[PDB]
């Protein structure tokens with residue numbers, strides 16, 4: 053009655069974090085009901101098995117697992133029938149031995165192929181079904197024709213299950229991986245912008261300091277650890293048919309590269325937070341001499357990252373990043389001028405080490421953000437995003 | 442004939458990168474042969490299906506998928522038989538309708554449960570088999586007793602397939618995930634040490650420069666991107682039974698934390714490499730004034746990281762890290778003394794920004810390495826590693 057309350061609030065949390073989870077939870081049920089009725093009213097364990105194992109969250113994942121299962125079952129049925137014909141051809145007591153030896157050799161060779169990188173990222177489930185169907189067809193004890201009917205039945209049922217799941221996955225309330233990847237990048241951008249604004253606010257400054265530590269740390273600490281997510285969403289979205297704004301080739305590799313550049317900014321930001329959170333604290337009246345330039349640079353980088361998030365959600369071509377970032381380079385120029393003013397020769401050198409480290413951090417962040425903005429513009433053009441602006 | 446040569450050298454590469462892949466490739470074949478013979482000489486499609494889908498690389502993965510399939514099939518057979526009894530109890534034409542409605546509701550609820558985090562990391566395949574077996578038993582058209590025999594047969598065959606795979610995976614040439622996680626951490630440590638030694642060598646300095654760029658970049662660039670690997674190996678090793686040096690509780694969460702601290706060092710190292718690889722080059726005769734201290738700190742950190750890798754491979758308690766790191770803090774003290782000597786007031790400030798950035802980077806790396814060494818010592822004690830030394 054106590055842990056039950058625990059999982060009840062867990063369930064409400066995981067639910068209201070995303071409602072499409074509940075809608076997909078109903079979609080799987082719909083698929084099972086339709087398949088059952090179609091094979092009751094007009095085997096059938098294969099139809100329900102494949103509708104459970106195929107239907108996944110996105111539409112890309114569903115289409116990908118569906119074509120994996122289909123094509124693999126087709127090719128495996130082919131090679132299996134060929135093998136069984138030759139096996140029955142040779143002899144009557146050697147048939148089982150040469151059959152089992154073929155199963156061994158083929159399973160071994162394929163299991164080894166499951167370790168290549170290019171085949172691991174895309175067709176791993178494909179190879180798995182290859183092995184499975186090969187051993188299904190080759191390792192039965194029926195007659196000549198029974199195997200042909202078994203093969204055609206397995207192929208047809210796999211196709212029907214896969215097609216039912218794909219249709220349901222597209223036409224009810226589709227969850228495209230493309231939109232999730234775009235939105236994930238936009239969320240990452242947004243968290244980095246929140247951190248940069250709060251830093252440009254709080255660097256030069258009991259429950260409130262901890263709440264601020266929450267709002268400072270966990271955003272970028274979740275930015276850094278999103279590599280498997282973006283790589284997964286890319287490998288799912290590449291299967292998706294053209295829908296909405298996306299043309300035939302929407303170069304997902306390039307978006308993943310943009311994610312990488314994001315994490316580079318996030319590395320430097322981690323260094324910045326680690327210097328903030330230190331106890332070796334430089335007196336504020338020393339940092340006073342540099343307030344306005346550093347705050348200008350931080351604020352402008354934050355605004356530009358923000359509008360970039362906007363442009364990755366709305367898919368609208370912008371050019372204000374040129375203005376915001378050129379002004380940031382000008383801020384770096386004025387900062388360079390302030391540096392030549394002999395303004396930091398009157399501070400003990402350990403402060404100099406700390407302050408110059410932080411200043412160099414922010415400089416690197418501004419230059420990086422210039423790089424990313426250029427990438428996103430040419431990404432909007434090659435993808436031919438709306439030039440409405 | 443050309444691409445064939447291509448995949449042939451790919452195959453030899455992926456092979457001689459690790460031979461246990463080939464041995465496991467033979468283990469799967471052995472499993473298929475034994476299962477086939479045991480169900481031929483004395484259904485059986487389920488035995489071969491479960492031996493293919495269960496048997497994975499490690500021993501942890503095999504045991505985990507095995508217990509997932511087993512326990513899920515047991516519980517699902519139970520609830521399925523209960524449901525079918527009640528369904529046949531109510532009526533004779535409403536039986537199919539209330540059956541299909543139960544299938545719908547249960548499949549939907551479970552598919553939603555597949556989105557919790559704690560259930561995703563461990564029992565996702567478990568929930569999948571839950572749905573699958575529930576729809577197998579509940580959605581057949583047999584009589585009262587046929588379902589009981591179907592349920593017992595499915596349970597027994599799943600158990601036999603799982604047990605055969607587990608035994609083969611343990612007793613032939615086991616691939617423990619524990620040893621792989623320890624060795625992976627040791628390899629990460631080793632690459633960071635190689636970089637630190639080469640940096641302390643080359644910071645103060647046509648085919649050779651590119652080969653050195655190879656040996657500088659790709660090591661740490663593969664350190665950073667190993668988060669899914671270490672999290673995966675932990676989630677596999679937690680299932681493993683106590684073997685070798687590992688006691689009952691070997692706190693894998695703590696080793697994963699040590700991996701995290703590694704990547705923190707790797708972030709700063711990425712910054713260092715990005716400053717090396719720049720074209721905005723400080724004249725060497727300026728960096729001359731700081732050679733011996735920076736080289737001392739780098740070399741000592743490299744030695745300590747190296748011996749830490751040794752201690753994570755051999756599993757032997759060491760204490761030389763205290764000496765190597767205390768000497769590094771003393772090097773930082775002497776560096777502090779050199780800084781108060783007014784030694785850098787005779788350099789244009791942009792050089793000052795660059796040099797102070799690099800010096801602060803190395804300081805952070807030394808402090809971080811002190812933290813990691815403390816963690817690994819108390820990790821050797823709580824795990825009760827051999828105190829031989």
Ligand SMILES: [Al+3]
Pocket residue numbers: 101490
């Ligand atoms: Al099956």
